[PDB]
Design a protein around this nucleic acid. Sequence first.
RNA 1: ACCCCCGUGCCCAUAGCACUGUGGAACCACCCCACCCCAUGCCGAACUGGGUCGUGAAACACAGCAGCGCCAAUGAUACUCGGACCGCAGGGUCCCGGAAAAGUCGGUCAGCGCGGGGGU
RNA 2: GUUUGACUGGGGCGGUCGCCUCCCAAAAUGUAACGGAGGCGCCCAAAGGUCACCUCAAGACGGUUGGAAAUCGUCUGUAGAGCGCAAAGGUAGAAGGUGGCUUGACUGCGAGACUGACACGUCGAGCAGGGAGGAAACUCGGGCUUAGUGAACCGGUGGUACCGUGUGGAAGGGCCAUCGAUCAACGGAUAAAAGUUACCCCGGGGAUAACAGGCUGAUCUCCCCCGAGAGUCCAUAUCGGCGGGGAGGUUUGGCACCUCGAUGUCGGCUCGUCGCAUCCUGGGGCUGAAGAAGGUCCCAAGGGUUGGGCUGUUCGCCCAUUAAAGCGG
RNA 3: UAAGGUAGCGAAAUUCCUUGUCGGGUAAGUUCCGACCUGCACGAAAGGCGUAACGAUCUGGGCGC
RNA 4: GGACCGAACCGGUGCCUGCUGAAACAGUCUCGGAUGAGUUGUGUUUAGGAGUGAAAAGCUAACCGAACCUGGAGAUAGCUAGUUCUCCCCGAAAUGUAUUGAGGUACAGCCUCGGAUGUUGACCAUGUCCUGUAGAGCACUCACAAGGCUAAAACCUUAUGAAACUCCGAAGGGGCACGCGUUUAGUCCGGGAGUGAGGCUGCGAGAGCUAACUUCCGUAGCCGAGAG
Lengths: 74, 49, 136
Amino acid sequence: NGRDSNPKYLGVKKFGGEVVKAGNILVRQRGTKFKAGQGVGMGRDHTLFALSDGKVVFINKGKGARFISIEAAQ
Amino acid sequence: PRIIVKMESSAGTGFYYTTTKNRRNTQAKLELKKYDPVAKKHVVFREKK
Amino acid sequence: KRTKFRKQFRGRMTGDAKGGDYVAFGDYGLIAMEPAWIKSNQIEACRIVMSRHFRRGGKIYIRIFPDKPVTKKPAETRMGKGKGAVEYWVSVVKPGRVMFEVAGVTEEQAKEAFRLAGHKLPIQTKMVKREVYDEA
RNA sequence: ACCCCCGUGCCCAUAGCACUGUGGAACCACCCCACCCCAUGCCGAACUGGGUCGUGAAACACAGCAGCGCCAAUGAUACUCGGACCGCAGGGUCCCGGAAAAGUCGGUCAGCGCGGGGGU
RNA sequence: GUUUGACUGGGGCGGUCGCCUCCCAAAAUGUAACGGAGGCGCCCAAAGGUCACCUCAAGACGGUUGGAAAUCGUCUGUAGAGCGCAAAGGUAGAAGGUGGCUUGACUGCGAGACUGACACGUCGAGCAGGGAGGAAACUCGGGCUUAGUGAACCGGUGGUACCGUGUGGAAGGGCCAUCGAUCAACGGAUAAAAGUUACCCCGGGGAUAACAGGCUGAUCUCCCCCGAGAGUCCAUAUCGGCGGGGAGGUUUGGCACCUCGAUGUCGGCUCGUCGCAUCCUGGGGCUGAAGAAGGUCCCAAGGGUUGGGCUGUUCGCCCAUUAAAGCGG
RNA sequence: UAAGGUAGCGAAAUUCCUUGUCGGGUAAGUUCCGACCUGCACGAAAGGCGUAACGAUCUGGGCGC
RNA sequence: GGACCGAACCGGUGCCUGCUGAAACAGUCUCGGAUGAGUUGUGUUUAGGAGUGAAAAGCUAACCGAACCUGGAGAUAGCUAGUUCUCCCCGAAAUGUAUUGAGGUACAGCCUCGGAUGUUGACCAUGUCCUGUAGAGCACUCACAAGGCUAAAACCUUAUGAAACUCCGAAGGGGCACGCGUUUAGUCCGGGAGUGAGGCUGCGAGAGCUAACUUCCGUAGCCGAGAG
Ligand SMILES: CC[C@H]1OC(=O)/C=C/[C@H](C)[C@@H](O[C@@H]2O[C@H](C)C[C@H](N(C)C)[C@H]2O)[C@@H](C)C[C@@H](C)C(=O)/C=C/[C@H]2O[C@@H]2[C@]1(O)CO[C@@H]1O[C@H](C)[C@@H](O)[C@@H](OC)[C@H]1OC
Ligand SMILES: [Mg+2]
Ligand SMILES: [Mg+2]
Ligand SMILES: [Mg+2]
Ligand SMILES: [Mg+2]
Ligand SMILES: [Mg+2]
Ligand SMILES: [Mg+2]
Ligand SMILES: [Mg+2]
Ligand SMILES: [Mg+2]
Ligand SMILES: [Mg+2]
Ligand SMILES: [Mg+2]
Ligand SMILES: [Mg+2]
Ligand SMILES: [Mg+2]
Ligand SMILES: [Mg+2]
Ligand SMILES: [Mg+2]
Ligand SMILES: [Mg+2]
Ligand SMILES: [Mg+2]
Ligand SMILES: [Mg+2]
Ligand SMILES: [Mg+2]
Ligand SMILES: [Mg+2]
Ligand SMILES: [Mg+2]
Ligand SMILES: [Mg+2]
Ligand SMILES: [Mg+2]
Ligand SMILES: [Mg+2]
Ligand SMILES: [Mg+2]
Ligand SMILES: [Mg+2]
Ligand SMILES: [Mg+2]
Ligand SMILES: [Mg+2]
Ligand SMILES: [Mg+2]
Ligand SMILES: [Mg+2]
Ligand SMILES: [Mg+2]
Ligand SMILES: [Mg+2]
Ligand SMILES: [Mg+2]
Ligand SMILES: [Mg+2]
Ligand SMILES: [Mg+2]
Ligand SMILES: [Mg+2]
Ligand SMILES: [Mg+2]
Ligand SMILES: [Mg+2]
Ligand SMILES: [Mg+2]
Ligand SMILES: [Mg+2]
Ligand SMILES: [Mg+2]
Ligand SMILES: [Mg+2]
Ligand SMILES: [Mg+2]
Ligand SMILES: [Mg+2]
Ligand SMILES: [Mg+2]
Ligand SMILES: [Mg+2]
Ligand SMILES: [Mg+2]
Ligand SMILES: [Mg+2]
Ligand SMILES: [Mg+2]
Ligand SMILES: [Mg+2]
Ligand SMILES: [Mg+2]
Ligand SMILES: [Mg+2]
Ligand SMILES: [Mg+2]
Ligand SMILES: [Mg+2]
Ligand SMILES: [Mg+2]
Ligand SMILES: [Mg+2]
Ligand SMILES: [Mg+2]
Ligand SMILES: [Mg+2]
Ligand SMILES: [Mg+2]
Ligand SMILES: [Mg+2]
Ligand SMILES: [Mg+2]
Ligand SMILES: [Mg+2]
Ligand SMILES: [Mg+2]
Ligand SMILES: [Mg+2]
Ligand SMILES: [Mg+2]
Ligand SMILES: [Mg+2]
Ligand SMILES: [Mg+2]
Ligand SMILES: [Mg+2]
Ligand SMILES: [Mg+2]
Ligand SMILES: [Mg+2]
Ligand SMILES: [Mg+2]
Ligand SMILES: [Mg+2]
Ligand SMILES: [Mg+2]
Ligand SMILES: [Mg+2]
Ligand SMILES: [Mg+2]
Ligand SMILES: [Mg+2]
Ligand SMILES: [Mg+2]
Ligand SMILES: [Mg+2]
Ligand SMILES: [Mg+2]
Ligand SMILES: [Mg+2]
Ligand SMILES: [Mg+2]
Ligand SMILES: [Mg+2]
Ligand SMILES: [Mg+2]
Ligand SMILES: [Mg+2]
Ligand SMILES: [Mg+2]
Ligand SMILES: [Mg+2]
Ligand SMILES: [Mg+2]
Ligand SMILES: [Mg+2]
Ligand SMILES: [Mg+2]
Ligand SMILES: [Mg+2]
Ligand SMILES: [Mg+2]
Ligand SMILES: [Mg+2]
Ligand SMILES: [Mg+2]
Ligand SMILES: [Mg+2]
Ligand SMILES: [Mg+2]
Ligand SMILES: [Mg+2]
Ligand SMILES: [Mg+2]
Ligand SMILES: [Mg+2]
């Protein structure tokens, strides 16, 4: 009635204004606190990862619906 | 006792198997799927064993 | 007194109270000055004193309420299994929080009734009539 | 160039709801019919296929309006990085920057593209 | 001949040992407790691929069985539902509810990243072979995610034709699939194992219990505030509900600080000495104090405080006395 | 559960509650004797209940000193 | 006559004394047996997991739950002690995960040395992004105070509590860039380690009495190894 618990690191991993290489993981989350943006892909656990290299950037609108996205260099 | 056993499927005249746990509840009738074996393209693997 | 409710046990610390610094109901009000827990029978003794002095008349409101469980380990054991399942319910009380307030009783009799009730509370406390008020 | 309609985006409640008024032969809408393309675990109600008329009834479009939502200051306070203290203790104070939540004043019933249709 | 786990506010008994979710966790991640709550050791040939369609809880009014909730109809209706199991995130342009065809619940790979001491664990664009659904863009290498698990060794089975001891074979082995783990003490000592010692031994520990001391003071002992009533009448002569505040450190305890290369423990005897919260004596106030005999509070620690029966007893009960037969260090 | 104590004895070298309750003894008896039974958890050859005599045995009383 | 009293003799009951003794088991006093299952001499036989034993695990050459001597043998010792000449430079750990593991050990972390790069380090500023704590608030869940309406539920006014509530939500904190500006480390490679028992205080919590020179985490500093 006490002994139990468990430890699974989660969170944003690549924050806005950072230069991700493509295939980088940018957020680990359990649901859709972030929705995959333009240039972003989301795997089974709703991880968001770079589709192509660029500047990571965040779009915030109402915390029901914000999105991570890539603005490529060049 | 035991319920949903592990079932190996011989490919249709191939040489390779696939193995998966077809539940023995509703899946009373032997498995017949399709899969790519040793040779050609997808063919009928008969999960009898 | 005891609530009919939810999770058995809790924690504890403090900061000055917000949820009732002003006397809405009634005329006069006794009011806490110190941050103790108040809990159950302490209040109920306040209630039974004031109801003796006043009843057949007056309106008695108890704006405070024994929300918070508090625990006692058994008897005499070592720091052992878990915490102790029961013991008494309390109400945290921060200064400016209003516990009591009478209605339909003359100023002086409310003085004497607040005096009796406050002679059995862990905190010292001050009474007041309601100034001008807002918050509606 | 002015007007309005049909689509369609950016922005997605300061742009939403309620009460109200205005539109029909441009446009949209209801509407008529349906054995069949097609279709409802029953019903052409909805998908669907052929078309007037009629009617803007409902819908939709536009306009009014601040009852409701939504936005939301200033003053101050809560709390607090940092600095220095008090109380035996629960707990409290001071200087220095940071600074809410709520609530009051007020603000709104949007704003900005692309096209195509029809008016003048 | 051996085995007979560990944690553990001493050890034992009890409980626990891997994995998931929330709080603790101090707005990054991480963070302990025999802290506070709850679940897993599965499930689903469709609850999966895809492709098409539908939208929930709840309430009100109205209606055959009904009579609060069934079924049907209108109205309101960011979700108050649902999501196979727990909880959390997420979710209505669905991940929810229903039908069509289907197996990608694929083979060979893996840019680049999350996470871990390691070994593990997670996500993943994109390339080929070959498929599935869609008219198409395109989606598919199991499931809305997060638990449903087990290194290695040793072996069962099916392929493959690497090895194979003079040579050609074969026996045997290897490579690819795959079967065997409450090895749950869940990084798993052997394939294989329980007790007892007061007959006990060794190495160690004040890293850790029993005595005592220390720190604390819940429990213990004692004093104070209020004043409900009792006291015929009057709260306070005496008593004082329900409640509040303190002191002491003599009780049982918590904690584990010096002492385990030793601080001898109950009771008696002997010898003392100290506190005072005073049993007697001495002085005072008040009394529900006429006298006498008392009650209770204040001052007071000079001295005094008996002999026996029972019991190891300390206590306590009793006998017979007493001014008194005090309580503690 | 295969059954559930026949005689005997019982607060006992066994009894926890306990100094059980009554009585005897004593001025006074947590011990000891006798009764009772409510036997925490007596009992028939790990023998039950008695028993004269014996005992550097253990327990309680008395006289003498 | 496994009868009585009682010397010798065999014994060892109770008290004292002795306790660096007269003595490594005794002395005085007292006491048991004393024709018997008795006492005693010489010779001789049984021994080490073995003998013997009217049975204590007794005795087996002054300490027997398995004798002594030599040998294997310097057994093994996650345990305790001890480990010696000088000055100079740097300088820790008492954390993490794993362990028939818990006072042991492996890996990492932190120390030092040599090589390589050669400002990538540190602080503080601006820009940007992330977060749900302090506070606050009742919009949901649970709890909850006085009224109203009412077949009590819902619903209206007034009014609160929250670790496992959140319409909101700071100060701070973390990543990245840049240096717009000061400083001086950083990283990679290879040799040698030790540490893995920590302690106190302030702030933030849990367990505990909002007890402890209490206990378990977080964070800053000192002790540890710091004299003045
Ligand atoms: C007095 C008689 C003997 O002592 C004891 O019995 C006992 C003495 C102590 C009190 C005791 O300590 C106690 O231990 C406890 C476990 C702990 C306790 N702590 C708390 C302090 C401690 O106090 C012991 C272990 C200490 C230790 C040094 C020891 O072993 C001493 C041994 C012998 O010398 C003594 C004798 O004096 C020898 O007398 C012998 O008596 C025979 C009958 C004679 O034939 C003769 O033998 C020929 C003679 O001589 C040998
Ligand atoms: Mg406070
Ligand atoms: Mg404050
Ligand atoms: Mg308020
Ligand atoms: Mg339009
Ligand atoms: Mg209208
Ligand atoms: Mg016209
Ligand atoms: Mg129609
Ligand atoms: Mg109209
Ligand atoms: Mg301001
Ligand atoms: Mg400052
Ligand atoms: Mg400060
Ligand atoms: Mg300030
Ligand atoms: Mg505001
Ligand atoms: Mg409008
Ligand atoms: Mg236009
Ligand atoms: Mg051996
Ligand atoms: Mg152990
Ligand atoms: Mg348990
Ligand atoms: Mg965190
Ligand atoms: Mg933090
Ligand atoms: Mg830790
Ligand atoms: Mg707790
Ligand atoms: Mg769907
Ligand atoms: Mg096709
Ligand atoms: Mg792919
Ligand atoms: Mg084989
Ligand atoms: Mg050959
Ligand atoms: Mg072969
Ligand atoms: Mg383990
Ligand atoms: Mg094994
Ligand atoms: Mg075993
Ligand atoms: Mg014995
Ligand atoms: Mg012995
Ligand atoms: Mg020893
Ligand atoms: Mg030592
Ligand atoms: Mg110690
Ligand atoms: Mg230890
Ligand atoms: Mg001792
Ligand atoms: Mg004790
Ligand atoms: Mg002690
Ligand atoms: Mg001492
Ligand atoms: Mg008290
Ligand atoms: Mg003590
Ligand atoms: Mg300690
Ligand atoms: Mg010594
Ligand atoms: Mg002792
Ligand atoms: Mg005095
Ligand atoms: Mg007197
Ligand atoms: Mg008199
Ligand atoms: Mg006496
Ligand atoms: Mg006598
Ligand atoms: Mg004395
Ligand atoms: Mg008797
Ligand atoms: Mg007895
Ligand atoms: Mg008598
Ligand atoms: Mg008697
Ligand atoms: Mg006796
Ligand atoms: Mg008797
Ligand atoms: Mg018997
Ligand atoms: Mg027998
Ligand atoms: Mg016999
Ligand atoms: Mg007998
Ligand atoms: Mg004899
Ligand atoms: Mg005797
Ligand atoms: Mg006698
Ligand atoms: Mg004879
Ligand atoms: Mg003899
Ligand atoms: Mg002799
Ligand atoms: Mg004789
Ligand atoms: Mg004789
Ligand atoms: Mg033998
Ligand atoms: Mg000997
Ligand atoms: Mg000799
Ligand atoms: Mg030996
Ligand atoms: Mg040696
Ligand atoms: Mg050897
Ligand atoms: Mg050994
Ligand atoms: Mg130095
Ligand atoms: Mg692990
Ligand atoms: Mg260790
Ligand atoms: Mg190392
Ligand atoms: Mg170097
Ligand atoms: Mg760097
Ligand atoms: Mg730099
Ligand atoms: Mg708060
Ligand atoms: Mg608002
Ligand atoms: Mg520079
Ligand atoms: Mg190295
Ligand atoms: Mg060296
Ligand atoms: Mg440690
Ligand atoms: Mg520590
Ligand atoms: Mg507590
Ligand atoms: Mg400590
Ligand atoms: Mg040290
Ligand atoms: Mg110093
Ligand atoms: Mg230092
Ligand atoms: Mg000094």
